[PDB]
Write a protein that binds this ligand. Structure first.
Ligand SMILES: Nc1ncnc2c1ncn2[C@@H]1O[C@H](COP(=O)(O)OP(=O)(O)O)[C@@H](O)[C@H]1O
Ligand SMILES: Nc1ncnc2c1ncn2[C@@H]1O[C@H](COP(=O)(O)OP(=O)(O)O)[C@@H](O)[C@H]1O
Ligand SMILES: Nc1ccn([C@@H]2O[C@H](CO)[C@@H](O)[C@@H]2O)c(=O)n1
Ligand SMILES: Nc1ccn([C@@H]2O[C@H](CO)[C@@H](O)[C@@H]2O)c(=O)n1
Ligand SMILES: [Mg+2]
Ligand SMILES: [Mg+2]
Lengths: 229, 229
C-alpha cells in the first residue's frame, strides 16, 4: 500500500535539502534519511568514526563501511514501513538512496578502485543478495527521483556543507561516482541483478541552479511524476 | 518440534569425528557441520581463502572472517530446520558449534587479543544482536554437548588432521580458547546476552582418550542425556 520512491544523487548534490521540503507538501509523505551522523560515531543499537576510517584508508575500511552502511539503511527503511505511515490514506515513503546505489554505485566503485579485493567483493555481493532475498520485497521501489548535478557543483557543495569527514574528497572520486549515476539513471545501461529496475520510472531533475530559485518548478514536476505511479 | 543440540569444543577436539557417528544411531537425527572447506574457498551462493587470511594477518581479517563465518552458519542451520527433518517422528538436529560460541569464544577472544578494534567489535555485536532477533528463536538450543580435551591434545590433533590453514596455530591460542570454553560450559561463569543459556542442560564428555576405545560409553551417555530433554 505504501508507495516507495528513492532519491538518488552524488555526494552533496542536495538530497537532504530536497528531502527537507517534502513533508510540508502532503501530510501522508514520510522520509528515511541516510544516517550519516551515526556512521560518524558508531554505537550499539563516544565511538569510532567509520566514515572517516574509510576515507583515511579505503583499502583497509571500505568493506567494513559498505557492509555497515547498507545494513543500517535496511534497518531504518524497514522501521519506517512498519510504523504509523502504514495507517495513512495515501502514504508515500521517500528514501535518501537505496540498497541498489549502495552496491552498484558505491561498493562497485570501491572494488573497481582496488579498495576491496576479490574476496571482499564476493563476500559483499553474497551478503547483499541474501539480505535482499530476505527483505527486497517489502523495500521494492515504485519510482526513482535522480537529482543530477555536475561533479564540480558537488565539490563546491561539500565545501558549503562543511561536514568534516568529506573535506578531503577529490574531484576525481566525485567524477567516477557521477558517471556511474549517469549510466544507471540517464543512459540506463548499467546492468544489475534486479530485473524490475530497468523499467522503474525515473524523474530526472537538474539541480545545478540555486534551490531558492528552482524550488517551485521542482515541486510541480514531483507532484506530476507521483500522479503517474 | 525439532530438538536442537549444539556440539561445542576447541579446534580439533573431535567434533566432526563425533558428528560422523550420530546418524547411524537413529534415522530421525540430522547434523549441520561448520562449512570449513567453504571458508577456505570463498564463492557466491577459485576464490579467496578467508580462513587462511585471518590466520596470516588476524588484525586485518578477523572482523571479515567472524562476520562471514557466523552468517554462513545461520544460513546452513536455517536450511536444515526448514527441510525434510521437519517431517520425521522424533527429529533431533545436532549443530557443530553455535552462534553463541562464534561470539563469546572466537570473536571475543580476537577482540581481547587486539585483533579487532573497538569499532569492529561494536559493529560485530550490533550485527550479531540483530541477526539473533531476526532468527534466534528458530535456532534456540535445547541442550549442549561439550567435548572437553586439553589444549595439548588439540594441538596434536591439528597435526593428525593436517588441514593446511591450521598448521601454524600456536598452543597459546588454543589455551586461550580452552579457558573460554571452561568458563562457559564447565564453571558456567561466562556472562552472555541470552539469559536462557545459563539454564540449558550441558553434557560434558572427556574426549582425551582414543575414540576407538571410548565410543561405546560416549554413545550411552548421549542417549541418556537426550532422554531427559
Ligand atoms: N540546489 C542548491 N542550491 C544551493 N545550495 C544547495 C543546493 N542543493 C544543496 N545545497 C547546499 O549544498 C550542501 C549539500 O547539500 P545536502 O542536501 O547536504 O546534500 P546531500 O544530502 O545530497 O549530501 C548544503 O550546504 C546545501 O545547503
Ligand atoms: N578421540 C579421538 N581419538 C583419536 N583421534 C581423534 C579423536 N578425536 C579426533 N581425532 C582426530 O583428531 C583430528 C581432528 O578431529 P576433527 O573431528 O576434525 O576435529 P574438529 O571437528 O573438532 O575440528 C582428526 O585427525 C581425527 O581423526
Ligand atoms: N553505500 C554508501 C553510501 C554512502 N556513502 C557515503 O556516505 C556519505 C553521506 O551520503 C557520503 O560521503 C557518501 O555517499 C558511501 O560511501 N557508501
Ligand atoms: N566463529 C568461528 C568459528 C570457527 N572458527 C575457526 O574455524 C575453523 C574450523 O572450526 C577453526 O580453525 C576455528 O575454530 C573461527 O575462527 N571462528
Ligand atoms: Mg544528505
Ligand atoms: Mg570439524
Amino acid at each position: 500500500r505504501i508507495k516507495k520512491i528513492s532519491i538518488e544523487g552524488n555526494i552533496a548534490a542536495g538530497k537532504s535539502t530536497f528531502v527537507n521540503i517534502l513533508k510540508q507538501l502532503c501530510e501522508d509523505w514520510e522520509v528515511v534519511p541516510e544516517p550519516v551522523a551515526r556512521w560518524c560515531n558508531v554505537q550499539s543499537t563516544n565511538g569510532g568514526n567509520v566514515l572517516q576510517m574509510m576515507y583515511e584508508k579505503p583499502e583497509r575500511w571500505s568493506f567494513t563501511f559498505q557492509t555497515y552502511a547498507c545494513l543500517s539503511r535496511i534497518r531504518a527503511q524497514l522501521a519506517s514501513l512498519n510504523g504509523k505511515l502504514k495507517d495513512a490514506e495515501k502514504p508515500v515513503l521517500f528514501f535518501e538512496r537505496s540498497v541498489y546505489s549502495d552496491r552498484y554505485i558505491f561498493a562497485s566503485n570501491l572494488y573497481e578502485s582496488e579498495c576491496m579485493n576479490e574476496t571482499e567483493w564476493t563476500i559483499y555481493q553474497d551478503w547483499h543478495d541474501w539480505m535482499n532475498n530476505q527483505f527486497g520485497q517489502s523495500l521494492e521501489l515504485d519510482g526513482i527521483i535522480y537529482l543530477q548535478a555536475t561533479p564540480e557543483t558537488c565539490l563546491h557543495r561539500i565545501y558549503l556543507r562543511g561536514r568534516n569527514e568529506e573535506q578531503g574528497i577529490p574531484l576525481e572520486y566525485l567524477e567516477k561516482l557521477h558517471y556511474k549515476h549517469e549510466s544507471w539513471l540517464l543512459h540506463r545501461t548499467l546492468k544489475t541483478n534486479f530485473d524490475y529496475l530497468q523499467e522503474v520510472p525515473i524523474l530526472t531533475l537538474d539541480v545545478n541552479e540555486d534551490f531558492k530559485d528552482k524550488y517551485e518548478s521542482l515541486v510541480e514536476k514531483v507532484k506530476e511524476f507521483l500522479s503517474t505511479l
